[PDB]
Design a protein around this nucleic acid. Sequence first.
DNA 1: CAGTAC
DNA 2: GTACTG
Length: 246
Amino acid sequence: ESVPVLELFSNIWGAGTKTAQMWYQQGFRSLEDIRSQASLTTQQAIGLKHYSDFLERMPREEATEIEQTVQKAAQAFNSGLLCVACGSYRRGKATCGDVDVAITHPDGRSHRGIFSRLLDSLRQEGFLTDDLVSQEENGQQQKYLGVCRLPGPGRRHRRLDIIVVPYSEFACALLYFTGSAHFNRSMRALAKTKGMSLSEHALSTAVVRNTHGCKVGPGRVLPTPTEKDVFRLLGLPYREPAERDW
DNA sequence: CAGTAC
DNA sequence: GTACTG
């Protein structure tokens, strides 16, 4: 009966094995015990009150409807903006656990100053309902993790990740956000053997590693305008997002 | 560390 | 594997 309790707690966003085990030792057994007696991060509090909804998957139709909401808000600021839903959606699954939306602009400068205003715009709609993590320092990239909800009756809260990248990084960003995790892990593992390195930012070609294999020097950033360029440079046959669902 | 994103 | 913040 301890194992299903650790399971219960782990499904709280921002709680993993260590936290669940600690809670168990405190004698907590139910979500109500957690809500009333446990110390929660603001993140953990949000995941707890959305516990049911977060367990639910969603139809890819609703994922579209979410990406449409984000795209419209962003476009209003600039119409040259590109919004692409990634993750399971781009891989073509019929269900999605969350919605992962990547934003860029082809001119490669108009993407700036959008991130802060876009979230603000979506908060005013009542679309974004809670915020979990905000990263504004990922180099030229900015990422937000949050919770939204489509308008209308009988709507559930959904996990939403929004990332903004420069067009010169759009290729490697799409590659990362689309996945899958095992797929991304595989490409990057492959690059390490070729003396390269892959990230959500760029693919680099002359990466130095020590005898033990620890990276001691960065490489040379290779210009990758599209995903196909990345596959090519790594000596790989191109895969479509649908084929990337490992 | 712990938890998270893919 | 790579890499953020809590």
